[PDB]
């Protein structure tokens, strides 16, 4: 039976070294390639899934108030490079309601949301690196403005700067952060609003864009959304895709937020398996006679490496199937095929345009396709990993005796 061939191969050094080099090729194929890595696509698919979720619903998300979730009389805080209605900014300017659950999002939470969204979109735009890479950096810059009387979301206390008018604050807490504050006076030349306002610039240097760094930002994005859970109000295009519900709380998308949260959890553990593959390098060979019972100490590590690769591939498949729209029903399928896997731009990744709202713009379909393409091209590699798993395991047992 096939176990006759398994032992006949388990004691053939040529047949073992062939599998070991098969494991290096498939290991480097997984964690060093990008186009051709089911693992890569599945991390990318998790990230872009979160990113796209906010692009679809941010423009309709209610937010306002002053500094610590406090109601504001006349505050307008505008965050730039955000998917607003008809705009590349989002405008938090809701007054005389305290922010909270099933109400407007605090400016305190929108800052966490916004910063994670800016770091993601830049990182996506540069291009996520292969999972082997942990030393990639990205520089990130984003601005918001505050206008209206009594708006203190830009004060020296909110931003920490030496002085709101012209000040700057630099942080190096490991990665460098420079915040700078600039007042535009109501009667300044160029001031179109004829109203004083404050522009905050955030410049982040050395921000890591590794799989775990970025998968962690995606978790900050989706989790702030789900925990603040602000009230929302959709504006369906006439003759475009219809959304349901039209009003409610952002948590009300329990199906969608859960899908995204498990996709992030799965890709985090998927990324956690790369360290296993690295620590069980399979490239040294294994002129004399060779008997399994004595000189087969590589078997444990050869099995740990192959099994890591297999779990990484299965997890990759799981990430995709959590969102693959052919397998989805009802509203969740409506959400995904009508909005999340669409881009209403007129469009590199991480591009915010005036028409980005109410569409995912995260190449979600192309990544789902790129994930399938990758897996169908893993046919040989996948069999060889299990074949190497079978050999290494029969040698662990010969080694026990």
């Amino acid at each position, epitope marked *: 039976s096939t176990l006759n061939t398994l032992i006949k191969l388990s004691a053939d050094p040529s047949a073992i070294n062939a599998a070991r080099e098969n494991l290096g090729a498939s290991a480097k194929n997984l964690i060093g390639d990008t186009k051709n890595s089911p693992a890569y696509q599945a991390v990318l698919l998790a990230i872009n899934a979160a990113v796209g979720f906010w692009n679809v619903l941010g423009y309709a998300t209610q937010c306002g108030g002053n500094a610590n979730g406090q109601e504001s009389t006349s505050s307008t805080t505008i965050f730039n490079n955000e998917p607003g209605y008809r705009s590349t900014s989002i405008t938090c300017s809701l007054n005389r309601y305290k922010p909270g659950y099933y109400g407007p999002m605090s400016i305190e939470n929108f800052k966490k949301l916004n910063e994670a969204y800016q770091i993601l979109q830049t990182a996506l735009n540069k291009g996520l690196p292969a999972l082997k890479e942990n030393n990639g950096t990205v520089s990130v810059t984003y601005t918001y403005t505050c*206008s209206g009387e009594g708006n203190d979301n830009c004060s020296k206390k909110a931003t920490g700067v030496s002085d709101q*008018n012209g000040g700057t604050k630099t942080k190096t807490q490991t990665v460098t952060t420079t915040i700078s504050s600039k*007042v535009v006076d*109501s*009667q300044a030349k160029g001031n179109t609003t*004829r109203v*004083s306002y404050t522009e905050i610039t955030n410049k982040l240097d050395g921000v890591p864009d590794s799989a775990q760094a970025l998968l962690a930002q995606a978790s900050t994005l989706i989790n702030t959304i789900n925990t603040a859970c602000p009230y929302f109000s959709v504006t369906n295009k006439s003759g475009g895709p219809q959304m349901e519900p039209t009003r409610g709380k952002l948590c009300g998308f329990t199906e969608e937020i859960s899908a995204i949260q498990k996709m992030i959890t799965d890709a985090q553990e998927l990324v956690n398996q790369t360290s296993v593959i690295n620590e069980h390098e399979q490239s040294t060979p294994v002129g004399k006679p060779f008997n399994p019972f004595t000189d087969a100490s590589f078997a444990q590590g050869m099995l740990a490496n192959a099994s890591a690769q297999a779990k990484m591939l299965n997890l990759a498949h799981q990430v995709g199937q959590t969102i693959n729209p052919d397998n989805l029903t009802g509203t969740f399928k409506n959400f995904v095929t009508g909005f999340l896997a669409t881009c209403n731009n007129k469009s590199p990744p991480g591009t915010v345009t005036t028409q980005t709202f109410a569409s995912g713009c995260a190449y979600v379909e192309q990544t789902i396709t790129n994930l399938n393409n990758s897996i169908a091209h893993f046919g040989t590699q996948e069999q060889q990993i299990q074949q190497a798993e079978n050999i290494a395991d029969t040698l662990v047992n010969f080694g026990s005796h």
Partner: antibody
Amino acid sequence: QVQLVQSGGGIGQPGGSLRLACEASGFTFNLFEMAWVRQAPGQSLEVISYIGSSGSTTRYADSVKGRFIVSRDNDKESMFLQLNSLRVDDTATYFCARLNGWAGSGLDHWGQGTLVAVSS
Amino acid sequence: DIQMTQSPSSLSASVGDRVTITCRASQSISSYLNWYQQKPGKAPKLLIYAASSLQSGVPSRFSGSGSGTDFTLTISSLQPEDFATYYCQQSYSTLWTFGQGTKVEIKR
């Protein structure tokens, strides 16, 4: 309770100089724009000078452009008007007023005035 | 420059009357016009901003109107504190300018 108290002023001669002081309290002085206004005896209100928040931006009426100097001191929350090269028709009450660009609400608050008169 | 022209320059009024001071701009100024009250020997205090916004603390007798070029202040029932002179002032050019004034004195 915004408050602007004025000092200096007095009696000048044709040519030569006076000075006006305006000490602010009860607001964050370095976020608001300030303006000097003067009012001749029987006349109306004339905007003489505007200075920005930072104090680096400066505008003058033609009637006075090359002849006075507006300045602010954001640490002690004070605004100053240096009237050099004086002329008889600068005889007026002089007012420092806070321009409120946050509300868009004009000259929110005014000092009490200080008297200027120049004569041989 | 933009020159504001008030009308009338003077007015004799009575307690409990409805008083109307108009103000005109040479150019279009949109809605950037304010009204001040000035009592003898003291600084003017602001009453109305943005053509129609009642500055806080100001009683509701006062009220603004107009846009672009022709504007109007209304007092719905004159009180003894109100006898003073009133100025309109435009906030559209590089340096703001006032009107010549309107003095409301008590009729008799």
